[PDB]
């Protein structure tokens, strides 16, 4: 049967005898658990290191992909030569290992990266202390803990004990988690902050409503798990933030799924609470858990207020945005069809709208479409048969790549749809929709303008080109390849146009070059250029834009890649050709060796070898050695290095880490390192 309930439990036997165990067998020969300690208190290392001390909850709450300490007390001291046991974390009524819901945790000697395991770190008396490491992709929820001792007759498991139950949450602190956020300030605001502000009003008259998210208050966490139970969300997917965010975007509104909040706009709000009355999320969600029925009522800002609590409570970093002059598209044409005329016209435009943004990687999308994802629980339009919206990649909306799931065309139309006064046309307005998008700033109640994340500035040619690309989701081919990109050196970006027609064309285009992480999260735009090229008939044209090294070297990170947007419009036919590609920089590295005894009080030779990576001629090569405690900083110059030729630098020194760096005239800031013990 489907296993989609954290509340439901199966019963795990305490004496899993196998075969025909003879009568009179003596199970006292084997270990049994007298006590288990989880150090669950909110001052101890577990909750503090896992950023869960805030939760008003007396049970162990950890975040996945991180180590926490437990202690198991046995009847006699644990002996590895004769004892074999494992820890188990179980969830649901139908737990299987291959479904992620039965998790065996073997007692190992060394914790492995991204694998479940427990390592002993203390053995005093009859007690062993364990550092347990969870998988950075583990299901999020309330697990049941067991200690299982293996015997030749079966497994001796502990009895059910709800005091050892453990919540495992999303970990925005673990670089192996899809919700990883490499910024403590951003983490404290988008995860640990339980209050905030929401903006509303008009574009020129802006009001501020404060909201108490209260994700750490008693009952809220269990409620969020209940919200997922009520959705019948299969447990095997509750570790995927894309599924958790999309299920939330449906379950917060009461339509078609008996969700948390009922939307009403009719100025009456009979037999319920007016939307303007709510000041936080705790009372809505708790009433949902108590009554087990939807709460009345809510509107745009209240849906986001509760959705924000749901996301932060589970661990997904989340913020609330406000779109002023948000458009409502009814016929999915990405236009505001205006006929005035109230009978034929069905497209509306709100003074403002509020939806949520959730921080996650998008492994289901190409590289570059991670980071902030737009999610809207407010019921506006159907999506695949339900009232939900997102996660839509804000990055995909900016360049009009609305073909990437989910519901990107809708969110694009909300922020940058043109007005079409329509058989016959008349006027076309292109600046009215999405005048301003805002969100609460870090460290204050100010207003961070984030309009530039969803769309290019109205007026600029990239805005139109992005829009016309979105509307698209004359015998001309278009492609671009990156010309031998080496870290620390200028490289060429060659846009190619092939015209197979007998006509002469004019092409307007823009180029967007971006640094993205290895996971696929965007960092920044380091180059943006618009350009115009003419295409003679039966020709090929290779316009090559030069990316200078100084343009991107300032914002690079470990294993970062380059994401390029190139959208070109055929002016004569108004066609739009759009490509997006990712490339990893060919990064040179410095090999550092140490020969000799590496003790203090004696000389040792540090050998630095560098290989010329370019087909060019390197001149004025400066190599710098740095290593505090080993050798004072020094520099070896090299007036010339021939192509594909290797250089070696020896440096004696009497003494920790060593860092080397090369910089020439055509290649700068290429590094190497080596950890040395002394």
């Amino acid at each position: 049967p489907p296993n989609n309930s954290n509340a439901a439990e199966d019963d795990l036997p305490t004496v899993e005898l196998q075969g025909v165990v003879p009568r009179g067998v003596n199970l006292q020969e084997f270990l049994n658990v007298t006590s288990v300690h989880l150090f669950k208190e909110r001052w101890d290392t577990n909750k503090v290191d896992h950023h869960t001390d805030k939760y008003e909850n007396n049970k162990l709450i950890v975040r996945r992909g991180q180590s926490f300490y437990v202690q198991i007390d046995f009847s006699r001291p644990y002996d590895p030569r004769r004892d074999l046991f494992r820890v188990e974390y179980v969830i649901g009524r139908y737990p299987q290992e291959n479904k992620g819901t039965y998790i065996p945790v073997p007692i190992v000697s060394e914790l492995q990266s991204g694998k479940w395991g427990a390592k002993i770190v203390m053995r005093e008396d009859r007690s062993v202390r364990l550092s347990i490491q969870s998988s950075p992709k583990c299901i999020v929820g309330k697990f049941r803990m067991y200690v299982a001792v293996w015997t030749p007759y079966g497994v001796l498991r502990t009895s059910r004990n709800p005091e050892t139950d453990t919540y495992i949450l999303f970990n925005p602190w673990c670089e192996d988690d899809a919700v990883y956020l490499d910024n403590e300030k951003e983490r404290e605001e988008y995860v640990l902050n339980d209050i905030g502000v929401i903006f509303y009003g008009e574009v020129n008259d802006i009001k501020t409503r404060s909201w108490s998210y209260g994700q750490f208050e008693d009952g809220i966490l269990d409620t969020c798990l209940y919200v997922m139970d009520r959705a019948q969300m299969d447990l095997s997917g509750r570790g995927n933030p894309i599924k958790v965010s999309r299920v939330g975007s449906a379950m917060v509104n009461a339509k078609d799924d008996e969700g948390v909040l009922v939307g009403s706009w009719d100025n009456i709000y009979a037999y319920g609470v007016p939307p303007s009355a709510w000041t936080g999320s705790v009372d809505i969600l708790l009433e949902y858990r108590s009554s087990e029925n939807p709460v009345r009522y809510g509107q745009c800002w209240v849906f986001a207020g509760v959705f924000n609590t749901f996301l932060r409570c589970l661990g997904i970093p989340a913020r609330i945005v406000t779109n002023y002059f948000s458009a409502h598209d009814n016929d999915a044409n990405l236009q505001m069809d205006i006929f005035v005329n109230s009978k034929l016209t069905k497209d509306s435009v709100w003074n403002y709208h509020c939806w949520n943004e959730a921080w996650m990687t998008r492994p289901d999308l190409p590289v570059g479409f991670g980071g902030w994802q737009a999610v809207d629980s407010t019921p506006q339009e159907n999506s695949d048969g339900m009232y939900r919206c997102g996660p839509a990649s804000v990055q995909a909306i900016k360049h009009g790549h609305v073909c990437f799931q989910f519901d990107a065309p809708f969110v694009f139309a909300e922020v940058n749809s043109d007005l079409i006064y329509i058989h016959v046309v008349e006027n076309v307005d292109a600046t009215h929709i999405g005048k301003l998008i805002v969100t609460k700033q870090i460290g204050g109640d100010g207003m961070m303008d984030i309009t530039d994340t969803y769309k290019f500035q109205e007026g600029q040619e990239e805005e139109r080109l992005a829009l016309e690309t979105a509307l698209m989701y004359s015998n001309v081919d278009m492609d671009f390849e990156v010309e031998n990109a080496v870290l620390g050196k200028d490289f060429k970006l060659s846009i190619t146009f092939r015209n197979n027609s007998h006509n002469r064309y004019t092409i307007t285009a823009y180029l967007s070059a971006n640094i993205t992480f290895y996971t696929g999260v965007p960092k920044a735009e380091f180059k943006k250029e618009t350009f115009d090229v003419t295409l003679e008939p039966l020709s090929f044209k290779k316009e090559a834009v030069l990316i200078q090294a100084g343009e991107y070297m300032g914002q690079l990170l470990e294993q970062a890649s380059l994401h390029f947007f190139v959208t070109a419009r055929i002016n004569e036919t108004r066609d739009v050709l759009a490509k997006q590609k990712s490339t990893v920089l060919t990064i040179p590295e410095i090999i550092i060796k140490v020969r000799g005894t590496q003790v203090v009080g004696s000389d040792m030779t540090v050998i630095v070898e560098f290989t010329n990576p370019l087909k060019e001629t390197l001149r004025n090569v400066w190599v710098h050695l740095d290593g505090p405690g080993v050798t004072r900083p020094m520099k070896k110059m090299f007036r010339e290095i021939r192509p594909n030729s290797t250089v070696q630098w020896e440096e004696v020194c009497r003494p920790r880490k060593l860092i080397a760096s090369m910089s020439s005239d055509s290649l700068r800031h290429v590094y190497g390192e080596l950890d040395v013990q002394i």
Partner: peptide
Amino acid sequence: XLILPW
């Protein structure tokens, strides 16, 4: 959240 005249 008001609907706004076109």
